[PDB]
Amino acid sequence: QCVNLITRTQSYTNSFTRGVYYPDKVFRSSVLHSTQDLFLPFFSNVTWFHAISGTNGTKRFDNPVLPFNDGVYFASTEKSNIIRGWIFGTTLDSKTQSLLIVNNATNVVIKVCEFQFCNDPFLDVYYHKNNKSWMESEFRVYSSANNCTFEYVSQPFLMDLEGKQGNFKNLREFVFKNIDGYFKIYSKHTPINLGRDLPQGFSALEPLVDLPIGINITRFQTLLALHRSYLTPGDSSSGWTAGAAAYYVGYLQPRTFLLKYNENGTITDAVDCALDPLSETK
């Protein structure tokens, strides 16, 4: 059965200077190299999808599937107990290949398959005392799966910290893009202090993986997991508990940047060109 559980509320914030990655797997030391590639423009709009999860009162769907456009910059503040991946596709049905990303507590599973499911993806996890480890069922949550073609497994992308400070630290800055047959996904995990949203400063996004697929994507969505205390009952309001499943979204556009590398070759700075007259001058 298809059910919705997220109280998706769309507020607006500024993009500031977050989401610029390393253009290619090439090192440079102490150079002011300048690039031209899809990136999140500075001081842009971020649709803060502030929300409360674990709510049975939102049974009707209220979260539209966000567009993919020319690159999506993503950030979150939730552990693997809340958010567990991203969904990409063109029609998000069994007619076109759908990319489903699941981030297990011990591994990462990426599957491209003709998944048939509704517009409310979720994963309900609970360690019942009968076995202390219960496995989810694809047939229950998802309607169908046909002609699965690509499967990839790796280590956890979310080295989540149990502490609340670490819980806020988990800024999984995952730029997703499809260029030259390449689904490039970068990574970041800042130990930055807790706040409300994207703080100041800059930190480049190192390549998490470069899948050799790079197919066009139209709709992008956030796959979240049902947060539970491993002791609450099942299908009840006293089961899935309320919690803030906040996740932000950006949008990449074609843009030229002036990078700046430190001694280690990390991109320690990036500036835009078409931002302002000073940016064009620089």
Place this chain on the structure above:
Amino acid sequence: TGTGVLTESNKKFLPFQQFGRDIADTTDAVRDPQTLEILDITPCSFGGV
């Protein structure tokens, strides 16, 4: 591919990074492909006569 002198390097390498570079597009360093070591490519001593 190149010709030069492979010398030990005192420069730290970011683990993500593969091979060195200089401002004038020159490969002035290279991580050893067999094991994680950084080797500076010193130009051969050619001057003139």
